[PDB]
Design a protein around this ligand. Sequence first.
Ligand code: CM5
Ligand code: CM5
Ligand code: CM5
Lengths: 508, 508, 508
Amino acid sequence: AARGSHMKDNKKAGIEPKVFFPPLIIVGILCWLTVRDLDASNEVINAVFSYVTNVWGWAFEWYMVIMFGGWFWLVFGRYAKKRLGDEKPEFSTASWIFMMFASCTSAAVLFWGSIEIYYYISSPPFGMEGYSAPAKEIGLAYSLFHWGPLPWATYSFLSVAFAYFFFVRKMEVIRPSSTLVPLVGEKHVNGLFGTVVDNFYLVALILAMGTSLGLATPLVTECIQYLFGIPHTLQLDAIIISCWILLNAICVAFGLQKGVKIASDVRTYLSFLMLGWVFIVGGASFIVNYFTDSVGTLLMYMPRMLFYTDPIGKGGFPQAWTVFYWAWWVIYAIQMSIFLARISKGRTVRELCLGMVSGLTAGTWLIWTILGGNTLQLIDQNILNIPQLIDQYGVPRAIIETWAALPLSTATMWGFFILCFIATVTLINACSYTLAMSTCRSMKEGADPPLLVRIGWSVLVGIIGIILLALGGLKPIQTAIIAGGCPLFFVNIMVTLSFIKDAKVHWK
Amino acid sequence: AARGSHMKDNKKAGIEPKVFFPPLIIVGILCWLTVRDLDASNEVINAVFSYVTNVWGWAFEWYMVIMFGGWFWLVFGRYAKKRLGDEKPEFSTASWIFMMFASCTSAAVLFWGSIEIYYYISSPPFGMEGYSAPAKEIGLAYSLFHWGPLPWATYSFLSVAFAYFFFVRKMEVIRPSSTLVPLVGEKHVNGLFGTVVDNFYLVALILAMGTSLGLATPLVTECIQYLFGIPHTLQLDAIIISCWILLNAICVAFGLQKGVKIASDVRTYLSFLMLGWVFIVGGASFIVNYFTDSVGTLLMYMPRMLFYTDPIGKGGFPQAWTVFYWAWWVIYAIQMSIFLARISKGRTVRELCLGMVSGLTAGTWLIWTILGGNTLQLIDQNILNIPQLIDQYGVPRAIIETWAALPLSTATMWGFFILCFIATVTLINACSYTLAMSTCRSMKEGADPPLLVRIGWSVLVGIIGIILLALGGLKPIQTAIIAGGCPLFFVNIMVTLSFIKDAKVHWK
Amino acid sequence: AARGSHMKDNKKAGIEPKVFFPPLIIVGILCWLTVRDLDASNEVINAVFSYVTNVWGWAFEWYMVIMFGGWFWLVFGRYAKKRLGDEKPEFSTASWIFMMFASCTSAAVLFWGSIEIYYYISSPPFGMEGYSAPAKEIGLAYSLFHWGPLPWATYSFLSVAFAYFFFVRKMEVIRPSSTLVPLVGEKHVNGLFGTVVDNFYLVALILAMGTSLGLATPLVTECIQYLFGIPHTLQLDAIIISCWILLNAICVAFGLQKGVKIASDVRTYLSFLMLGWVFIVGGASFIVNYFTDSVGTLLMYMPRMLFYTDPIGKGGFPQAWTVFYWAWWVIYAIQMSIFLARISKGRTVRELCLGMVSGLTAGTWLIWTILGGNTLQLIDQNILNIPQLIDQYGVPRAIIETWAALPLSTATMWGFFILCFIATVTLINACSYTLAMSTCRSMKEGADPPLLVRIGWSVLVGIIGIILLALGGLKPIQTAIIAGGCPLFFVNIMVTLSFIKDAKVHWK
Ligand SMILES: OC[C@H]1O[C@H](O[C@H]2[C@H](O)[C@@H](O)[C@H](OCCCCCC3CCCCC3)O[C@@H]2CO)[C@H](O)[C@@H](O)[C@@H]1O
Ligand SMILES: OC[C@H]1O[C@H](O[C@H]2[C@H](O)[C@@H](O)[C@H](OCCCCCC3CCCCC3)O[C@@H]2CO)[C@H](O)[C@@H](O)[C@@H]1O
Ligand SMILES: OC[C@H]1O[C@H](O[C@H]2[C@H](O)[C@@H](O)[C@H](OCCCCCC3CCCCC3)O[C@@H]2CO)[C@H](O)[C@@H](O)[C@@H]1O
């Protein structure tokens, strides 16, 4: 225990058993149990989904309401004009929006963007009849709601909190625990409380990352089946997941940050090209008209959508969608808010709140109205039988089918194939990075994490994906999200309370 | 006419014939006529209800709209930051809310809270079908509307006006007339104009107080019938009303202010216990879910509910409920606003407007969603046949039946019995006090009113209750409220105009 | 080319070939082609209507949304407190409102005010059933929308822009082109760009003026047929149009500005008398109740109405009405905004925005609810068969029939006859004035335009009316409006961008 041991900040690199082992053990144990009996796992998975959504769905809904309220408080309250770092923004306002407008590009987004409208239209909210005109007229509006300005505004409290911690308090924050000192004290932060918090967070994050794989993988393999004729099987999925891991491993080992960043740029520009293409050849005039109509419908129904539980009719719509999506929002809040904070030094509180909500919803509104308007038309015109395609082949095939129904079919599918593939590479890279940084001992800033830790995490995330795929269907992915959401409900609130308490003292 | 007669402020105690005799004569004459022929009275009662609501319902609706607008003007306008008395508030912000949150406890509230949803659900607005899902889905929302933030916000103009008169102008105000000097001048105030105004007010108030009895009494006697087996009759009602009068008389004569105040505290805490109990054992999960859903529905329909007259379909919904309840709101505005003003010295205008609307609706929202969600479930599950119970026994019995349907039935009914009983004691005490103070000569501050005047008024109010009960049903109570509302429509407006005019001069 | 030619501002009077000839040629050519084959013109007219509304209707809708947003920016933004001229307003606030509240009086307003509800009720939006209760309950609300605070608020940007140009920049502005210097530069303004802009504007205006005639004329002749027995024919219409032209010619030639102004005053006061009469004897109680109900319905549906395209059901409602009316709004924006600017010197930006929206909607709300509530009742009670009347005689006859159905039938029709007649005289006078001023060389301020130019334009406008009448029905009038609207979509936006750019520099 010597010598010269406590004569400075820690300054050495490696794993921190505090937070490295428990996640590994917990996710490992869960994977093993899931695989023991896939049919009984699915039975429990379904019971967990139904229980949380039906019994605690209301709390997820009130969380979004409160956070939405917070956005107004930030935009109009005492902090509106506070600068987040006295320096000038490190980006032009345009590159700043472009960076948000770019982070919207993802594989999960192409998944839900392409298919969620089919579900809204066939099993409508508010007791409407499946496939009726009124079901069709509310379909996109409900996307504009679940992926619009309201959900994005709920990230504002956390984004401002983190930019305040980074740039006014000048704290290095990696783990949630590090922001809670104003709230519970250093004893609790550094003790067991802060350890549990950080471990619950990491588990939720790990599961969430697996779900991203679980959704992105089948899209890529359906593209592969369509383009090359290689049949989509669970083995093809395990093969592609392996390639991503190896690719990641080669990128990390040889430190190709430069190349990965360029890939990130290509995915962003390909996204624009692909959406623009779908718009131009998918029925531009209908899409513009349908979007316009859906805005007014969204504005009218919004308060109804925000507080919807269907307690009389019990059709289950809010439970299946709103609660699940809100859990998705809650799971990714800290992660997304940190990234928004980082690109926002020098901006004012109100500037951050207005800009992020503007640029981010532009991104998501565009994706869901173009892909959703395409899908809706294909259903309307009987070009596809989506129910039949799903019952036979699975959801990912039905999605690929909405893409291949467009002109220049083979070229279009090349575009999408490339998009979903690079997106997943940059997602794996980013995922492995975050997990490594969060489970290793405090290391000098600007330094990359221990390589073997980083690769090891990518492998565990890949395992989770293949199991989710083995389990089959949407339900396992949805329940992993709902599960992770439950703890992070409390973690998110704790970080914002911590910010609010600190700000009383150091922001006046 | 001497001597030394006008060498100071009046400083002596007794009745003021200006305002003591006319009310007595008017209410006496009305009681006598009503009793002459109960069946013809009821016929006229019904015709007065239908006429005012159908022909002048729109004016009651626009009154609430304007007053609601005024709330925004107060919160965002030139007066927002004005303090109501330069002193520090005489209560902590918590005890201040608790005092509003406490004034919500009443017998009339348990009456309407328990039953109004049955009516909304069986004879729905907007042409919906009775007992349909959509009727059930709007039922609580319509309670959240009639007893929510909008009606409470309409008291803000009067509450601010009175706190301005009490604490900035330092005027002793008892009667409405005393605030009108800036508006019509001292001649009119002290002359016939101010006398008519104060007499119309007192008559409306007297009728309104009778209706409180008329509603509270049958609840207590249904509790008595349930608990002790004593059949509910008109004679049992006259007996209980007598006991309240005697109780009041003993409390006043021996000056037991201390004890009455403690009773007030018990009723407040019993209310919390009873509502909490109903919530915990009445279907907590359904109640939370139904409340959440109803908020969104309320937010969506609010503008429609605010301006509703049903002029095409003529189903009569707004006339039966909204207009009647708005008359109820209008009748009690001055009284409630004076009480809100008194507990608000030292608060700013905006503080008063935000706090009262927050604390008061918390109180009323809780009462109507718990009691209404209980009742709705009992109807849903066919535990009770409310229509049958009402046709056979009357509304009060159906209400008691929703309470007795809960676990620990006998204990629960003891809780409610005690609640409605003490509530009525403190209501009678407060009622008799106000009437005495308003009909007697200006007396030195902090002094209790002439005892025989005070008891005499409690007796006249008791008479009005027993007649209302003799008349039977809801209609007589509703028409007395609508009748009183008509004059006070103009009185309320006069006080706020008076405040607005004065404030131009003395508040800048 | 001499001498002393460029030693001052131009200072001489006559036509400016830049902008005098092209309009004349273009409208002349169009008139001639239209008349060549009335049945084929109507076929093309119908195809132009369907194409613009269906394909580009969305752009008209987003234009109103953006302009509406601008109103909030003006009321709450950096310019809210800027004064439009440092002088004191040249009118009392009352005479200022009265002047807006007066400009609402017109023949076109009596036309649409009287009949549009019949169309809303018989061919309802949102897939409702014709003549159903819900169709009737939304009917007036849709008038309150198309002629309410939202459309009036969209004039605020242009009204503020022109008052800024007139009173802060002290520029003489007659033609749109003259405001674009900050936007495109003097070269473009004085060159071809500014010439095209001003010519497109003048053509749109000329067509629009013809439509006013095309609507006002048949109302007057139906009144003439009703009162005097003279059969309504195309020849009677050509005769009345001639009388207006001659009347105008006599008024202009002998410079009877005084008398025309008095006529303007009479029309204003007659309007009040006629509306007040219709209200008092047309079912006051129903009208008050129906208006109240319609406000709440309007507030609830507004966001839905604002963004409505009906892309699924394709019932065509928004295309037939909203898009057409928005084109009407767009066509008259510059003209109306100049007039609002002129009567608003010395007012602040926010004052102009609040006052104009308040006074103007008071005017239009009153007209459409009184005339629309009258018409609705006549349909409800089966006093008239409007469809039958229209198929047989045309729309103008059905309108006159709603007026003649009121008590004192002969006197009422005298009132309306006089109203529509003087209204059209003052409209022709104002129209001819504007066209003259816009097509003639810059002349010294306060000077009347060349008389023969002024009369000549009134004649061309009269021709356009008679052709529109020869074409028959509503469609030609609607398509001329939609046609003119398309160019002025861009002209309106250009003036506001020009104002915004200039204001950055000279308003701080
Ligand atoms: O004096 C103490 C401080 O209080 C203020 O807080 C206000 C802010 O000034 C004010 O902008 C803010 O308004 C937003 C309140 C929350 C509204 C939530 C709803 C917004 C609209 C509909 C969705 C929900 O309300 C806060 C209090 O409720 C501000 O924080 C400071 O300006 C002020 O100094
Ligand atoms: O200059 C004169 C004074 O005017 C102001 O009054 C404004 C206030 O500043 C401003 O806050 C207030 O806004 C509320 C207007 C009423 C809105 C009613 C609607 C509110 C929202 C929807 C329900 C109805 O409007 C008033 C005028 O309409 C304020 O009284 C002062 O700040 C100011 O000095
Ligand atoms: O610092 C730069 C300037 O920015 C401000 O602009 C604000 C204004 O202060 C602010 O009042 C204004 O609010 C209105 C924004 C547009 C809202 C449109 C919606 C309004 C409600 C629903 C219909 C549409 O937003 C502007 C920016 O979006 C103001 O122009 C100045 O006060 C300020 O100095």
